[PDB]
User: Fold 3-ketoacyl-ACP reductase from Burkholderia multivorans.
Amino acid sequence: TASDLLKPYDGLRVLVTGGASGIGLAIADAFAECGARVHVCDASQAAIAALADRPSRAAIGATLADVSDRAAVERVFADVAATLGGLDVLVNNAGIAGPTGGIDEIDPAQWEQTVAINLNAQFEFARRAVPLLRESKHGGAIIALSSVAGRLGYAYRTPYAATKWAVVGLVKSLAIELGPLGIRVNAIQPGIVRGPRIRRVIEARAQQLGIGYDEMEQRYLERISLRRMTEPAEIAATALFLCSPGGHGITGQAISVCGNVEVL
Amino acid sequence: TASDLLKPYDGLRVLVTGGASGIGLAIADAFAECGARVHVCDASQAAIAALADRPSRAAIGATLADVSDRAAVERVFADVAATLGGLDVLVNNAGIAGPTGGIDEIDPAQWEQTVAINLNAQFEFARRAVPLLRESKHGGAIIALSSVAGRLGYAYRTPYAATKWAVVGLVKSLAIELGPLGIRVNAIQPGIVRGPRIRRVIEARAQQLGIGYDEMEQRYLERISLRRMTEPAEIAATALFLCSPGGHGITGQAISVCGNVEVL
Amino acid sequence: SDLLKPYDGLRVLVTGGASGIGLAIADAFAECGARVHVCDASQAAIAALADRPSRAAIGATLADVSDRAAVERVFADVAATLGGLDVLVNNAGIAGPTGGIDEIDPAQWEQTVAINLNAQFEFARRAVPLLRESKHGGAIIALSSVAGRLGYAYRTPYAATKWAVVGLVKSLAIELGPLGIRVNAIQPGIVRGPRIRRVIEARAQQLGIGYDEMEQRYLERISLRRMTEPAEIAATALFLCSPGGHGITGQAISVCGNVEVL
Amino acid sequence: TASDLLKPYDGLRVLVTGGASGIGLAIADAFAECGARVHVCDASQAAIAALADRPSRAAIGATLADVSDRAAVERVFADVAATLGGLDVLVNNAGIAGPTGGIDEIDPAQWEQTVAINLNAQFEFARRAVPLLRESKHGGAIIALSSVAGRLGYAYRTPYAATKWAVVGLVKSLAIELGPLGIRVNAIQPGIVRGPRIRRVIEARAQQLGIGYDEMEQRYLERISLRRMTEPAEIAATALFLCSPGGHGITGQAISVCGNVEVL
Assistant:
């Protein structure tokens, strides 16, 4: 049935990293709207506090954790085990923009921090989630958040691009490795996504190039085939589709949700 | 809402080429379940006659046409204009396997027919559909059927692989070209799809390699990360998702629905 | 050392080899001791091959590559003179039409596919029985384009065929590898010469802008900010036919200054 | 002049990281044969001592350095400055295989060490080389060593694959960033390269899968289209070509030198 082909499996146990704001919250709330038992971790106490008692919103569990903090990561899984009691979906969503600048300009600690959060934390969560996901009635799923910078080069954003390409290779390797266990592994590659984060990116890149914000933003928009920024709800919908009967045969793939970003 | 994000727009006017059997029929029937006004063309009179009066199946219009026959393609669009009155989605599904054999063994006329059906017909339908699609209230959509052989090499299937790669290049060019008009253009790449067509392919390749059917089938299954063939309904579900609000912002992409075919 | 010297005495056929990139490749091989033969659709270009002071003799057949009888004449000419084949350079190609997919002449779509795609098959199917007997392991060098790794608005038949070439190369590399035949695509970028100037002119008209503005848009989307020279394409083909490059197969090598987008 | 096209520029000042053994030494020796002023760093004192006084081998400079220690990297560039007096080519060759095992099995410390050496050290050397390379009379070049594991998924080798995909994204980003300065940036992707390193890899993977060395080796070989391993001199040849007039206009590319590894 076409109707239920597109309905995410009911009752999924979902963990979304960096899930109390932005795209991660859009994903977490979308799963929660579909009968999922959702837990998020997030680095922002204010973001976590803002989740509670939102009138139109099912409850979501939350752990304060910086994803590059191993003790904190273990607390996330302890909190998941104590409440969800299992795991069907890991959304490896947490990430930072990293520095903007020439490779000879950027601060080494900012490079390493971008790698630790955007890449090493993907491993830290995947290594702990795999023993849970292999027990999922639906075939376990890992959904990793790459970027259009994981399929294109991105001048003045080398640590960001490096990690987003790394996520693609990590997904394609895990898809082969975990496929026979039943665990699907895909990357979503968001484009230019409307919200506070991209405005910080545009502002920083405008400063890097010596041009105004309005001109920098226009350069981004004219390089989208649809001439329109991506909405976070499009990323959430794609994640839901991967966890529906119709999409649960997809694995090993990077799905760019971007209006066709033509070049960065 | 998450449920609305994943529902195809209501009332879509949809044309599915080669739509009376196999994957094309799964796509046509899926759209028809979601309130679409669906027309198909097909080369098989018997397949077309088998559409009518199936229990719980909404009516689907059909034109008898071989897509390599320009006169019959023109009649397809006349039948669509006289019934649907426009077009919102072109599903460029029609295709053939082509011959199995070394490049120095295969009949040149079979190379040529593979190109005429798998590549040239895509242009024939796209060029006639674009003037209609640019008037679609939703923007318009072209959904091309490539294959995993459009992202991998395929020994002994060179005309098939050449055309399925060509479809990706066509999609990526049209996405740029038509994006500002609002038309989304994507390829779906089916994997090893359960059906009579793949069984004929396996039998032909077994004969090419001098092995039995069951050994050939096992070689294909071992090279799917999920270790199972793709269902036609998965292809249909992906097409429906691209015509939903949540998938409306995807264009210029090839989406492989294949359980991760690792190699051909 | 020896690593970068192409194998001496190679028997090479270059399609569309009497002008442009194809002639660049053909002459480069002839400078390295190869016995080279070309086909070309222009008898004027063929007549210009002879009596070139600094240039070793190159054999030639007049042939439109979409004409099967003409293709068979090329191989008959090669067999009568070269007596074998070590390298097929599938170089012949046309730009095809410039325009929206709903605007272009279907006959020009078909012509682009016939020349850029079907002819690749027509030459490969006849070369393979020769190439598999090569002492060096036979080679097929196919000319794709940066339009074979990027989308190209208003150039859909061209892009479709250049992507097809990549898929054909990757399929043939698997198919023919165990026979020793290497198969690769070279993807030239924005290559200096008369043909790119016709393309820029045609695209400027499509976009209603002047030639100079159209040209500057192409140049600013090359990371090196300069057009590719034909000799670079020729050099890459030679490298694939050297000891150091002869373990490369299944690949598309973009020689383009990094065309960032089309 | 076809001979002038393929020979590297005379007098190139070349730094090869990890250059006293394996592929890196092959590259260093190849450049030294073509009139280059070559310097290497290496983590093994014993490997460095074996460079001296080899018959008809031009002398090569060396610095003892673990590419993950910042002070040793600073000494590398100090020795280069004191002897070469500049830099035309950085060869980012240093790397390790990392651990063999499922993602839930591998030591996190060895995940981290793989990322530190295969990715973070590329940044450490590139950021110090770029100020030198932008003064290169020939324009400057970075040659990064990726792997076929940077264009394919690699089960039970996830840190290695992730870092080798990262190198591709880093290369494509730097090619855009540094192109207008004249610096060419490419990745070479070696396949299954004959040497002691690949025999350790095969041994390790055979133990992971519970098969013998010969069977594991045979699986690798049957998935090379040319059915033979790549020689290190092929990698060196490709590096030399990128530093010739004929290869001078290639940038932003990953070149796989692998006999077509069909799958991992």
Summary: Chain B touches chain A through 49 residues (CB under 8 Å).
